[PDB]
Design an enzyme around this catalytic site. Structure first.
Site, PDB file in Angstrom:
ATOM      1  N   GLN A  83      28.934  43.018  26.524  1.00 50.01           N
ATOM      2  CA  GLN A  83      27.646  42.382  26.780  1.00 50.01           C
ATOM      3  C   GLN A  83      26.576  43.438  26.503  1.00 50.01           C
ATOM      4  O   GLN A  83      26.657  44.535  27.051  1.00 50.01           O
ATOM      5  CB  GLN A  83      27.555  41.870  28.220  1.00 50.01           C
ATOM      6  CG  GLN A  83      28.517  40.698  28.487  1.00 50.01           C
ATOM      7  CD  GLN A  83      28.486  40.193  29.937  1.00 50.01           C
ATOM      8  OE1 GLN A  83      29.364  39.409  30.347  1.00 50.01           O
ATOM      9  NE2 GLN A  83      27.480  40.628  30.712  1.00 50.01           N
ATOM     10  N   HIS A 135      22.659  43.626  26.858  1.00 47.81           N
ATOM     11  CA  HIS A 135      21.754  42.681  27.544  1.00 47.81           C
ATOM     12  C   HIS A 135      20.945  43.304  28.697  1.00 47.81           C
ATOM     13  O   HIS A 135      20.755  44.486  28.702  1.00 47.81           O
ATOM     14  CB  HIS A 135      22.591  41.516  28.060  1.00 47.81           C
ATOM     15  CG  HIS A 135      23.441  41.878  29.238  1.00 47.81           C
ATOM     16  ND1 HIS A 135      23.576  41.063  30.348  1.00 47.81           N
ATOM     17  CD2 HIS A 135      24.174  42.988  29.496  1.00 47.81           C
ATOM     18  CE1 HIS A 135      24.379  41.646  31.220  1.00 47.81           C
ATOM     19  NE2 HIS A 135      24.745  42.818  30.731  1.00 47.81           N
ATOM     20  N   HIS A 192      35.975  41.203  38.852  1.00 38.51           N
ATOM     21  CA  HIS A 192      36.692  40.301  37.951  1.00 38.51           C
ATOM     22  C   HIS A 192      38.189  40.224  38.321  1.00 38.51           C
ATOM     23  O   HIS A 192      39.068  39.999  37.449  1.00 38.51           O
ATOM     24  CB  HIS A 192      36.488  40.695  36.448  1.00 38.51           C
ATOM     25  CG  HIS A 192      35.148  40.285  35.864  1.00 38.51           C
ATOM     26  ND1 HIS A 192      34.707  40.732  34.631  1.00 38.51           N
ATOM     27  CD2 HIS A 192      34.162  39.481  36.345  1.00 38.51           C
ATOM     28  CE1 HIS A 192      33.513  40.220  34.381  1.00 38.51           C
ATOM     29  NE2 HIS A 192      33.165  39.445  35.395  1.00 38.51           N
ATOM     30  N   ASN A 225      34.757  37.288  30.973  1.00 35.70           N
ATOM     31  CA  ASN A 225      34.409  36.850  32.327  1.00 35.70           C
ATOM     32  C   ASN A 225      35.240  35.595  32.728  1.00 35.70           C
ATOM     33  O   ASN A 225      35.124  34.550  32.094  1.00 35.70           O
ATOM     34  CB  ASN A 225      32.871  36.600  32.542  1.00 35.70           C
ATOM     35  CG  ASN A 225      31.964  37.403  31.592  1.00 35.70           C
ATOM     36  OD1 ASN A 225      31.993  37.171  30.412  1.00 35.70           O
ATOM     37  ND2 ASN A 225      31.150  38.300  32.110  1.00 35.70           N
TER      38      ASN A 225
HETATM   39  C1  LIG Z   1      28.593  39.529  42.244  1.00 34.83           C
HETATM   40  C2  LIG Z   1      28.528  39.186  40.777  1.00 34.83           C
HETATM   41  C3  LIG Z   1      29.322  38.147  40.292  1.00 34.83           C
HETATM   42  C4  LIG Z   1      29.633  38.132  38.942  1.00 34.83           C
HETATM   43  C5  LIG Z   1      28.626  38.585  38.107  1.00 34.83           C
HETATM   44  C6  LIG Z   1      27.448  39.108  38.709  1.00 34.83           C
HETATM   45  C7  LIG Z   1      27.584  39.747  39.941  1.00 34.83           C
HETATM   46  C8  LIG Z   1      26.543  40.677  40.505  1.00 34.83           C
HETATM   47  N1  LIG Z   1      28.635  38.224  36.815  1.00 34.83           N
HETATM   48  C9  LIG Z   1      29.378  37.206  36.398  1.00 34.83           C
HETATM   49  C10 LIG Z   1      29.138  36.581  35.067  1.00 34.83           C
HETATM   50  O1  LIG Z   1      28.426  36.932  34.117  1.00 34.83           O
HETATM   51  N2  LIG Z   1      30.068  35.628  34.753  1.00 34.83           N
HETATM   52  C11 LIG Z   1      31.249  35.535  35.395  1.00 34.83           C
HETATM   53  O2  LIG Z   1      32.043  34.741  34.959  1.00 34.83           O
HETATM   54  N3  LIG Z   1      31.433  35.974  36.639  1.00 34.83           N
HETATM   55  C12 LIG Z   1      30.436  36.733  37.190  1.00 34.83           C
HETATM   56  N4  LIG Z   1      30.548  37.218  38.470  1.00 34.83           N
HETATM   57  C13 LIG Z   1      31.666  36.748  39.318  1.00 34.83           C
HETATM   58  C14 LIG Z   1      31.761  35.253  39.578  1.00 34.83           C
HETATM   59  O3  LIG Z   1      30.820  34.958  40.557  1.00 34.83           O
HETATM   60  C15 LIG Z   1      33.138  34.897  40.099  1.00 34.83           C
HETATM   61  O4  LIG Z   1      34.047  35.093  39.039  1.00 34.83           O
HETATM   62  C16 LIG Z   1      33.174  33.465  40.633  1.00 34.83           C
HETATM   63  O5  LIG Z   1      31.893  33.195  41.155  1.00 34.83           O
HETATM   64  C17 LIG Z   1      34.238  33.210  41.728  1.00 34.83           C
HETATM   65  O6  LIG Z   1      34.074  31.910  42.267  1.00 34.83           O
HETATM   66  P1  LIG Z   1      35.141  31.126  43.164  1.00 34.83           P
HETATM   67  O7  LIG Z   1      34.897  29.700  43.022  1.00 34.83           O
HETATM   68  O8  LIG Z   1      36.577  31.629  42.842  1.00 34.83           O
HETATM   69  O9  LIG Z   1      34.766  31.689  44.648  1.00 34.83           O
HETATM   70  P2  LIG Z   1      33.611  32.727  45.153  1.00 34.83           P
HETATM   71  O10 LIG Z   1      32.352  32.613  44.279  1.00 34.83           O
HETATM   72  O11 LIG Z   1      34.079  34.068  45.576  1.00 34.83           O
HETATM   73  O12 LIG Z   1      33.219  31.899  46.501  1.00 34.83           O
HETATM   74  C18 LIG Z   1      34.144  31.164  47.284  1.00 34.83           C
HETATM   75  C19 LIG Z   1      33.825  31.218  48.766  1.00 34.83           C
HETATM   76  O13 LIG Z   1      34.735  30.803  49.764  1.00 34.83           O
HETATM   77  C20 LIG Z   1      34.339  31.512  50.928  1.00 34.83           C
HETATM   78  N5  LIG Z   1      35.341  31.924  51.879  1.00 34.83           N
HETATM   79  C21 LIG Z   1      36.019  33.062  51.736  1.00 34.83           C
HETATM   80  N6  LIG Z   1      36.912  33.063  52.755  1.00 34.83           N
HETATM   81  C22 LIG Z   1      36.778  31.917  53.471  1.00 34.83           C
HETATM   82  C23 LIG Z   1      37.446  31.428  54.575  1.00 34.83           C
HETATM   83  N7  LIG Z   1      38.418  32.122  55.163  1.00 34.83           N
HETATM   84  N8  LIG Z   1      37.067  30.189  55.050  1.00 34.83           N
HETATM   85  C24 LIG Z   1      36.036  29.442  54.491  1.00 34.83           C
HETATM   86  N9  LIG Z   1      35.386  29.928  53.387  1.00 34.83           N
HETATM   87  C25 LIG Z   1      35.762  31.143  52.895  1.00 34.83           C
HETATM   88  C26 LIG Z   1      32.970  32.093  50.797  1.00 34.83           C
HETATM   89  O14 LIG Z   1      32.010  32.383  51.761  1.00 34.83           O
HETATM   90  C27 LIG Z   1      32.597  31.829  49.401  1.00 34.83           C
HETATM   91  O15 LIG Z   1      31.249  31.693  49.108  1.00 34.83           O
END
Ligand SMILES: *Cc1cc2c(cc1C)nc1c(=O)[nH]c(=O)nc-1n2C[C@H](O)[C@H](O)[C@H](O)COP(=O)(O)OP(=O)(O)OC[C@H]1O[C@@H](n2cnc3c(N)ncnc32)[C@H](O)[C@@H]1O
Ligand SMILES: *Cc1cc2c(cc1C)nc1c(=O)[nH]c(=O)nc-1n2C[C@H](O)[C@H](O)[C@H](O)COP(=O)(O)OP(=O)(O)OC[C@H]1O[C@@H](n2cnc3c(N)ncnc32)[C@H](O)[C@@H]1O
Lengths: 573, 573, 52, 104
Positions: free
Chosen positions: A403, A405, A503, A548
């Site tokens: 990337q 950017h 990741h 990603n």
């Molecule tokens: C931090 C970050 C992320 C990132 C990035 C930029 C940054 C600074 N750049 C990205 C990009 O250009 N493109 C890309 O593909 N990914 C990028 N990322 C990461 C991306 O956000 C992740 O790959 C993706 O968002 C993961 O999503 P997923 O659907 O797998 O889940 P999550 O976003 O981590 O959120 C899930 C959640 O569930 C919760 N949680 C956790 N434990 C529990 C329990 N026990 N009970 C109930 N809920 C729970 C969370 O609070 C949460 O929000």
């Protein structure tokens, strides 16, 4: 009591909700975090006029919601304390560090986000596809078959995330960097716009997509959806999935209502865990899958042995360049400048339509206007020029994602000293061989903030191909970046903290056979043996990938949803 | 068309909202910033379960919505770029810097916050009263009348915020420091808890107050107030109030919708500006009042001459301590200890109710248990133990405000390294004499992110008593802190960047008479000459004050509200 | 500068700083071994680190 | 202007300079090793009194210059070490190694 329950309101949590809610199911969804984004639930926090005018301030918001997964016990020596101050005689476990953690086989950078929408409230939005070489097979022995499946599933994910590649065509700086790079690599390498999950609205506003884009997270029925049924319950830590004795079925989800404090058992037909690579893994281990504790081969678990193993995280190199003089001059190559700026004799003109012009009329009209209207300013790039989103995608001969950017810029003098128009970011994302020895495990005695077993890392980057490729990757970023310009001090070529890239994958990985493919879910994303338990997210991806993962996790999610639809009737409304 | 329009949705704009919406008026409120604090519109962002379990991390949320008021042209020499990178030969204007600003006559720390709820979505919540010596007069020649009127306004204002002085009374750390300082100053200084706009919900959750507390910002009529009329319109930059040629009245408000792009002209019987100390001024200056541009005592302005003059900001010294050995031993002074930690025979015992104990039964039970359940921990202070909130209020023998506490600080290297519980913060706030030569003005040439005239400061700390006091204050912090522990290496006694503290006052100052008290609004907070233009915020305070101002600014706004309910009629339901 | 040129530290504890941004092709120990002459008898917390 | 304030330390048996019977230094001699902490009590009290004094006194000439705020320095950097081969009238009763003639 519901048809489906979803743990986690992230983008994959929400893929499952989107599909099932509009397929007539009654969906309940819990997330540990809260609604943290104004009146569009799960929305990207960077979508406010303040931020799009003050984009640099956004890095702070990211760090606000990256809570470190595993922090080793600190052993820094502060020996300038006053003699009247209390000092221990040891480096005891303090400020929550994880005394299981080997500071030297950690993923120190790994962090997590608890907010409705997950890390999608803050993400950069890169949504590219994996080529055959990063891709798990959905079908074996029919490449064409496999490609058909992936194209169909990818195209739906792109639909859901509003991915496109056009949002940045009319940035100079974007075009400057992309054209220079194409020139140079003379058909070894395709350069293009990073595909990005977002829609533009004015020359100065983009609507970055998110969980909310996939699914708007309103309780249902509502006026716009009076037939659908969906409820989102934030402030709930899901803790345990209860197993039948046969290990063929989940019978409930034990939850902790953090507001009330009280606990609850929730019953459903279909159980979907979408809580993230770390916490999808953590809940299942807290639920009797895998092995609680420091891992012990002389006592290997019988349920999901491969869980928490073969964990991959990407090497990540970074730097920033200050654009070359040659390229600034090139911007204004069609212009005929006379006089000295600021004096009254001074003029800049271009011949519109001229076939010998190197740039189009729109470009030159911006450069003319900027230079005549701001004689005080010494660069020909207009003031609110959009920023570059260039990429060359992973290939066999250059096995890493790239990337070129601008993201999350935390300004430390020499990045406010330099004019931000000159600055371009390079990030190159290596791939990691999945290896059994690399683990995510949970302590049988230590606990984290929400009272769950403490995650712990045994990770080092596999020697051999991953190590070789990762350093090849660095030298490539240096070769490539040199073409646009020299490094900007305070942002020299570097490797980043392991795990900061966020990741992580392979923690609950996918295969055709549990045993032979060492995995925990099938290509339907179902847990082997269990009739009604699916996992969504990067935990699923078994392979070595540089690009990603989110758009591939969503792809697999969409595939899983289809199994569900084919095998569980929504209850009647 | 409305009865009242409020510009700004801070705690103060809400103070006007609560009194006027309640009284029966048809009220419109605009804020340039948007809803992002989740579902409780404008609530304090620290009130999630996560941030209360991860206090360290909140610093970043505060950092991310403090957009600097005026940033001077950077002249840092970067002489290490590559020779191929572009570099200018001059320090030209860039990255949004402000060319008018003398870097040496600035308030560089000054910053502003554009999000619904204002700065009250991130503030520490200290809401003390001003003693007579920092207060403006509300009754002349009647210091008991003037005492009653204020006691009455401040009691009403405390109610609105939920101000309290005992939310931390069961903190072991709080009392240890509170008590030690009391012993130490033994009839010289009185110490008590910081008064705090905050309601405790559980031993480990405080519900911090905010603009939300004052007014729930929920559009009306609704079910709970169906005979009330209120609307909050976020993402609306108000650019200008419109004068009559008489200057006796305001006729309309010109606004700019940042989602649509379009501008409009709103009408109202009453106009109330609560857009902040920096921006209340801007608006006004942008609406005919005061002078535009580099100020010029040759050509002086016909409207509100004194606007943007006599500005005050506080001197802030800061530093952290590491609790002394003596003080830490004292915590567990009642315990009998047998054996040695981690043994099967290890005992920690106290005798409940023993006349020779030094601490109450509750404190000892906490100590004992913590020592028994965490035998690997070398400290007697329980883990989940709330932080100190200790103050010795401004008196004239010590003319500054003090906070011996813990507040969102970005703990660095020696500060995850020293155990949190040992750490205390020290913040002393000096009072600044109002001086005419201290100015907030606005460029006739430059403009901010919203094309409003650019703020430029002309500030230096008065020589004389403001400066003598400031240093006597730095010295006092040193003398006093030296009683709880030594300095935390990395957080040594220091003056903070001017304005960093964010307590700027007197930019649109209150007084009885316009010329005699060189001021902009009377004691109803109404602008002199104008029949229906009111102003709220810290910018109203004309005096030299050290304590945190917002409670006093509220107090004045309530009074302004009385005037309003007494001269203007609500249109009917 | 000249002073620091001739102040050779008496007792330097074994360093335990974590550098974890090294390239994957670089050699890394799995321990904080005695290296660059530090004194493995030294308690980093009851030292006279400044003594030279 | 520079301020440096130099506290005094109670000589205490428990504070030692010893040499390793297996480790060696650069010139092939046993490696020196420190067991030192500042005695709690009078030395500790005085040392923090000293800081507050430097702050009281220095304020009279002017404010601290950033990057040089009141601090305690690394133990031993002051290079004023003593008592390692100390003096007395009697070896035993005065716990010492030389007499007031400086003879062992
Ligand atoms: C931090 C970050 C992320 C990132 C990035 C930029 C940054 C600074 N750049 C990205 C990009 O250009 N493109 C890309 O593909 N990914 C990028 N990322 C990461 C991306 O956000 C992740 O790959 C993706 O968002 C993961 O999503 P997923 O659907 O797998 O889940 P999550 O976003 O981590 O959120 C899930 C959640 O569930 C919760 N949680 C956790 N434990 C529990 C329990 N026990 N009970 C109930 N809920 C729970 C969370 O609070 C949460 O929000
Ligand atoms: C930043 C901060 C604040 C703070 C604090 C610690 C921090 C880090 N600790 C304090 C303490 O503990 N107790 C206390 O007394 N105050 C402390 N503060 C300061 C306090 O938050 C502010 O003084 C208080 O919020 C002031 O209230 P007010 O409502 O008068 O102003 P505001 O909070 O700044 O909100 C005003 C808003 O209106 C907006 N705006 C700006 N321009 C426009 C235009 N043109 N049109 C419409 N609205 C506009 C904003 O977007 C904003 O939210």
């Amino acid at each position: 009591k519901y048809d489906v329950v979803i743990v986690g309101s992230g983008p994959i949590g929400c893929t499952y909700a989107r599909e099932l809610v509009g397929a007539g199911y009654k969906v309940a969804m819990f997330d540990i975090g809260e609604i943290d984004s104004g009146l569009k639930i799960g929305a990207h926090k960077k979508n406010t006029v303040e931020y799009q005018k003050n984009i640099d301030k956004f890095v702070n918001v990211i760090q606000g919601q990256l809570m470190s997964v595993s922090v080793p016990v600190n052993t820094l020596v502060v020996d300038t304390l006053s003699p009247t101050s209390w000092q221990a005689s040891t480096f005891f476990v303090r400020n929550g560090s994880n005394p299981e953690q080997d500071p030297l086989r950690n993923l120190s950078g790994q962090a997590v986000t608890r907010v409705v929408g997950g890390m999608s409230t803050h993400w950069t939005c890169a949504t590219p596809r994996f080529d055959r070489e990063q891709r798990p097979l959905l079908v074996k022995d029919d490449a064409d078959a496999d490609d058909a499946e992936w194209d169909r599933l990818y195209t739906k994910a792109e639909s859901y995330f509003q991915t496109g590649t056009d949002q940045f065509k009319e940035s100079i700086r974007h075009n400057l960097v992309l054209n220079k790079l194409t020139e140079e690599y003379k058909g070894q390498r395709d350069f293009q716009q990073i595909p990005l999950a977002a829609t533009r609205r004015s020359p100065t506003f983009v609507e970055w997509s998110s969980a909310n884009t996939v699914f708007d997270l309103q309780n249902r029925p509502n006026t716009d959806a009076p037939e659908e049924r969906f409820n989102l319950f934030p402030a709930v830590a899901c803790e345990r999935v209860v197993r039948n004795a046969l290990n063929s079925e989940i019978e409930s989800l034990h939850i902790h209502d953090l507001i009330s404090g009280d606990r609850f058992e929730i019953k459903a037909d279909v159980y979907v865990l979408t809580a993230g690579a770390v916490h999808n893994t953590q809940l299942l281990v807290n639920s009797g899958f895998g092995q609680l504790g420091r891992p012990n081969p002389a006592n290997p678990p019988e349920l999901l042995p491969s869980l928490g193993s073969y964990i991959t995280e990407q090497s990540l190199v970074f730097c920033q360049t200050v654009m070359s003089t040659e390229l600034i001059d090139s911007v204004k190559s069609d212009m005929t400048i006379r006089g000295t700026p600021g004096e009254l004799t001074y003029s800049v003109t271009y011949t519109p339509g001229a076939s010998t012009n190197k740039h189009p009329d729109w470009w030159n009209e911006k450069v003319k206007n900027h230079m005549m209207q701001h004689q005080e300013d010494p660069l020909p790039i207009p003031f609110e020029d959009p920023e570059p989103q260039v990429t060359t995608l992973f290939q066999p001969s250059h096995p890493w994602h790239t990337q070129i950017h601008r993201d999350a810029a935390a300004a430390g003098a020499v990045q406010q000293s330099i004019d931000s128009r000159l600055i371009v970011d390079w990030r190159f994302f290596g791939r990691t061989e999945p290896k059994e020895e690399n683990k995510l495990w949970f302590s049988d005695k230590i606990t984290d903030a929400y009272n769950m077993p403490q995650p712990t890392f045994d990770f080092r980057f596999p020697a051999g191909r991953t190590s070789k490729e990762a350093e090849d990757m660095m030298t490539d970023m240096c070769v490539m970046s040199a073409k646009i310009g020299g490094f900007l001090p305070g942002s020299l070529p570097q490797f980043m903290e392991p795990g900061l890239v966020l990741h992580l994958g392979g923690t609950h990985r996918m295969g055709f056979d549990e045993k032979e493919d060492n995995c925990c879910v099938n290509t339907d994303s179902r847990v082997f043996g269990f009739k009604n338990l699916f996992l969504g997210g990067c935990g699923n991806i078994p392979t070595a990938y540089g690009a990603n993962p989110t758009l591939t996790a969503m792809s697999l999610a969409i595939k899983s949803c289809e199994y569900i639809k084919q095998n569980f009737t929504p209850s009647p409304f």
